[PDB]
Amino acid sequence: KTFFGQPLGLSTLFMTEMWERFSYYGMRAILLYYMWFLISTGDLHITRATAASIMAIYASMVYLSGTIGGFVADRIIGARPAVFWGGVLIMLGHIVLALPFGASALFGSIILIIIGTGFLKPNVSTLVGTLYDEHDRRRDAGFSIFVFGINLGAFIAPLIVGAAQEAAGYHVAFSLAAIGMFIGLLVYYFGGKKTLDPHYLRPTDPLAPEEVKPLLVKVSLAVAGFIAIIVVMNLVGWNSLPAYINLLTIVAIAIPVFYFAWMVVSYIPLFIAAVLFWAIEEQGSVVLATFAAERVDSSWFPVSWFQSLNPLFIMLYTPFFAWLWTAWKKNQPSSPTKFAVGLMFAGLSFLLMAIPGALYGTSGKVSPLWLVGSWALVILGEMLISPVGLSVTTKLNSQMMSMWFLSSSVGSALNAQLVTLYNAKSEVAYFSYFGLGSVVLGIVLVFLSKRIQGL
Numbered sequence: 191k192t193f194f195g196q197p198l199g200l201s202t203l204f205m206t207e208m209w210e211r212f213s214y215y216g217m218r219a220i221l222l223y224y225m226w227f228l229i230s231t232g233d234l235h236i237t238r239a240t241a242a243s244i245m246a247i248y249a250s251m252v253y254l255s256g257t258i259g260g261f262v263a264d265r266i267i268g269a270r271p272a273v274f275w276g277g278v279l280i281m282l283g284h285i286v287l288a289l290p291f292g293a294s295a296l297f298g299s300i301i302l303i304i305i306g307t308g309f310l311k312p313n314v315s316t317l318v319g320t321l322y323d324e325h326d327r328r329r330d331a332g333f334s335i336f337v338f339g340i341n342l343g344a345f346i347a348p349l350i351v352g353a354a355q356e357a358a359g360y361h362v363a364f365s366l367a368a369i370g371m372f373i374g375l376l377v378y379y380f381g382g383k384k385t386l387d388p389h390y391l392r393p394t395d396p397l398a399p400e401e402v403k404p405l406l407v408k409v410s411l412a413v414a415g416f417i418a419i420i421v422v423m424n425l426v427g428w429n430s431l432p433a434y435i436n437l438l439t440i441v442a443i444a445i446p447v448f449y450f451a452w453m454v455v456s457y458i459p460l461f462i463a464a465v466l467f468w469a470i471e472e473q474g475s476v477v478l479a480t481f482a483a484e485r486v487d488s489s490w491f492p493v494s495w496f497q498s499l500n501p502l503f504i505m506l507y508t509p510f511f512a513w514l515w516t517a518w519k520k521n522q523p524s525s526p527t528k529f530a531v532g533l534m535f536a537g538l539s540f541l542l543m544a545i546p547g548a549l550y551g552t553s554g555k556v557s558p559l560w561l562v563g564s565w566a567l568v569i570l571g572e573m574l575i576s577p578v579g580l581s582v583t584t585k586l587n588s589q590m591m592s593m594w595f596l597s598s599s600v601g602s603a604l605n606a607q608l609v610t611l612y613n614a615k616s617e618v619a620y621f622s623y624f625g626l627g628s629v630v631l632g633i634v635l636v637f638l639s640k641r642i643q644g645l
């Protein structure tokens with residue numbers, strides 16, 4: 191007996207992640223509109239631009255947090271408690287928004303979810319690995335199934351949580367996100383005790399006695415430096431929310447920049463390609479979400495439901511490309527070539543979105559099929575770059591590996607700056623330029639492709 195050919199324990203981790211992703215993308219699909227609401231009532235004193243900026247830097251920090259949680263599990267608390275307590279923090283984050291507060295609860299929610307996801311996300315993925323002996327051929331299949339559970343959660347949550355929001359309001363919808371994580375904890379806790387190795391209740395590489403102090407010194411100096419920067423910021427009068435967002439942008443970009451400088455050259459165009467690609471892919475929940483609400487005739491259905499298109503297309507495309515990369519025996523494109531083309535599709539997905547405004551004006555409303563087409567194109571690009579991203583990075587070590595996972599944090603950090611440029615007046619130029627820019631850089635990478643596959 192198996193779960194799709196895999197060890198039964200995969201079913202537990204599959205459902206754990208399904209419900210965690212349910213809670214996350216449920217929250218994400220209505221959080222921008224929530225902020226709009228809070229602005230409209232005078233409760234939240236920011237612009238819509240800044241609110242878009244918040245969505246982006248929020249994602250950036252969630253990704254950054256994720257590149258840290260593995261270390262914390264492996265060296266300090268253990269992967270199994272990391273997933274558990276991570277999930278508890280996430281749940282608390284959604285409960286905070288379900289409570290009868292307004293703008294004042296936003297920051298606490300965000301911090302809880304940033305920390306919680308940093309604990310849970312890398313570490314569930316680690317427990318999936320543990321189901322398999324070192325040389326088990328099923329490993330890639332198992333991970334492919336696990337990812338399907340991720341995508342399934344991402345897909346149903348906007349539908350269910352978005353509907354809930356429109357029927358019963360924001361607080362009830364947010365409480366549904368909390369309940370989703372709770373279900374995931376239930377299944378995780380009781381299902382985990384049945385199938386997971388007891389070894390992973392503890393760190394597998396605990397800090398040695400002489401490793402504790404230098405770690406403490408490092409963290410302490412980092413916190414002190416960060417705090418000192420904020421202090422100087424407030425002294426020189428740079429203390430608005432955009433300023434704080436800018437500080438976080440700089441931190442998220444500085445981190446790979448320093449890693450590069452420390453250290454490879456061949457990787458820079460690949461990494462820049464990844465960054466730009468994730469930028470465009472992460473704007474679906476921000477700029478495309480805005481377009482959905484403002485420019486699409488969606489009067490008969492919740493506009494949050496558009497956020498389901500991204501994981502729908504991932505799910506549709508995935509078995510096809512799985513087959514494709516095996517069927518394509520002779521002259522399959524190299525990984526650098528995949529990045530190039532992947533970025534070109536991202537670019538096409540924005541170029542497409544420039545058409546309706548150019549043709550019809552930006553004052554009216556256009557068909558939902560423009561967005562459907564846009565997501566169709568960007569996910570095509572995702573199928574090209576995502577499955578080879580870690581591989582091409584690895585084959586070109588622990589720090590640079592993380593830079594691949596960092597690419598999406600950097601992409602979102604960049605978004606925190608760019609999405610503030612988006613509005614009805616700039617819509618066509620915005621989609622045109624960043625669309626065109628991505629295509630062109632994709633063409634640059636094609637030129638560089640031969641040199642790179644060589645190295």
Ligand SMILES: CCCCCCC/C=C/CCCCCC(=O)OC[C@@H](O)CO
Binds near residue numbers: 542559560564566
């Ligand atoms: C096999 C790989 C290709 C699959 C992805 C390609 C899909 C690209 C679609 C772009 C065109 C869709 C936009 C057309 C559109 O907006 O229609 C509006 C019109 O139908 C209603 O007024």
Ligand SMILES: CCCCCCC/C=C\CCCCCC(=O)OC[C@@H](O)CO
Binds near residue numbers: 375376380
């Ligand atoms: C309305 C508050 C009363 C609820 C009692 C407190 C429990 C509430 C939330 C716990 C969150 C994690 C639940 C996951 C779980 O299965 O807990 C396992 C627990 O039995 C470990 O011994």
Ligand SMILES: CCCCCCC/C=C\CCCCCC(=O)OC[C@@H](O)CO
Binds near residue numbers: 443447462
């Ligand atoms: C050495 C590797 C560092 C990686 C940094 C990641 C980003 C790399 C290049 C920046 C991409 C384009 C930046 C956005 C841009 O062009 O701004 C256009 C301007 O209109 C915005 O005000």
Ligand SMILES: CCCCCCC/C=C\CCCCCC(=O)OC[C@@H](O)CO
Binds near residue numbers: 534541623
């Ligand atoms: C397997 C696919 C490989 C072929 C990909 C070739 C790239 C295809 C089309 C590039 C279209 C670029 C046109 C952009 C454009 O018209 O911009 C106009 C806009 O900037 C006006 O301000």
Ligand SMILES: CCCCCCC/C=C\CCCCCC(=O)OC[C@H](O)CO
Binds near residue numbers: 270272378379382
């Ligand atoms: C503040 C509300 C949340 C309170 C949560 C209930 C706390 C009760 C018991 C703590 C459970 C600790 C479990 C740690 C853990 O690793 O669980 C993993 C499971 O053994 C499966 O791997």
Ligand SMILES: CCCCCCC/C=C\CCCCCC(=O)OC[C@H](O)CO
Binds near residue numbers: 235247248255300
């Ligand atoms: C290693 C990751 C740890 C970094 C955590 C820092 C991230 C903290 C906040 C993310 C940026 C959110 C700023 C917007 C925000 O908090 O909204 C607050 C309300 O708008 C108050 O007006």
Ligand SMILES: CCCCCCC/C=C\CCCCCC(=O)OC[C@H](O)CO
Binds near residue numbers: 302
């Ligand atoms: C070292 C891991 C421990 C993680 C602890 C994270 C703590 C983050 C936030 C704590 C406060 C969150 C709730 C704040 C809140 O409920 O807002 C209501 C008040 O009106 C706030 O102004």
Ligand SMILES: CCCCCCC/C=C\CCCCCC(=O)OC[C@H](O)CO
Binds near residue numbers: 281289359361362372
């Ligand atoms: C251990 C609890 C984990 C389960 C998640 C907790 C969610 C429990 C109950 C949800 C209650 C949410 C109240 C919604 C609410 O406040 O409605 C007020 C609205 O403003 C009125 O339309």
Ligand SMILES: CCCCCCC/C=C\CCCCCC(=O)OC[C@H](O)CO
Binds near residue numbers: 396397398399409
């Ligand atoms: C925002 C504050 C971040 C929280 C600090 C993170 C941890 C900071 C320093 C590392 C201390 C970790 C505890 C060390 C520990 O318990 O391990 C014991 C050793 O295994 C015994 O040899």
Ligand SMILES: CCCCCCC/C=C\CCCCCC(=O)OC[C@H](O)CO
Binds near residue numbers: 406409413
């Ligand atoms: C945000 C400010 C910087 C944060 C500093 C985090 C400090 C938190 C805990 C430090 C604990 C000091 C290490 C001693 C320790 O915990 O090891 C005990 C071992 O378990 C005994 O073998």
Ligand SMILES: CCCCCCC/C=C\CCCCCC(=O)OC[C@H](O)CO
Binds near residue numbers: 412416429430431434
């Ligand atoms: C390098 C690790 C240092 C720890 C990073 C955690 C940083 C926590 C918050 C960063 C600043 C975000 C503040 C957002 C905010 O609410 O500002 C609003 C102001 O209070 C009013 O304008």
Ligand SMILES: CCCCCCC/C=C\CCCCCC(=O)OC[C@H](O)CO
Binds near residue numbers: 423428432436437
């Ligand atoms: C030796 C390092 C010292 C500097 C650390 C790097 C971070 C420096 C500045 C953070 C960026 C602050 C941007 C402020 C800003 O955007 O203008 C102010 C607001 O727009 C309006 O209040």
Ligand SMILES: CCCCCCC/C=C\CCCCCC(=O)OC[C@H](O)CO
Binds near residue numbers: 496498499559562
């Ligand atoms: C299991 C397959 C289910 C696939 C459908 C999932 C629905 C997800 C998002 C719905 C987004 C709304 C699309 C609107 C639409 O396509 O309508 C086309 C008509 O031309 C509208 O005028």
Ligand SMILES: CCCCCCC/C=C\CCCCCC(=O)OC[C@H](O)CO
Binds near residue numbers: 510
């Ligand atoms: C078995 C895998 C291969 C199957 C290919 C699946 C492609 C299915 C639908 C793609 C639809 C393409 C949209 C056509 C299109 O964009 O035309 C635009 C028209 O000008 C709109 O008036």
Ligand SMILES: CCCCCCC/C=C\CCCCCC(=O)OC[C@H](O)CO
Binds near residue numbers: 542545
């Ligand atoms: C294999 C990946 C490539 C798939 C590309 C197929 C799509 C080809 C052309 C789509 C061009 C988009 C413009 C469609 C358009 O404007 O139609 C006009 C509509 O009637 C406007 O209401």
Ligand SMILES: CCCCCCC/C=C\CCCCCC(=O)OC[C@H](O)CO
Binds near residue numbers: 538539548619622
């Ligand atoms: C293979 C599928 C291709 C789908 C995307 C191809 C679209 C190609 C070019 C679209 C760029 C449209 C730009 C329109 C534009 O910028 O004109 C500005 C007008 O003056 C309106 O402000």
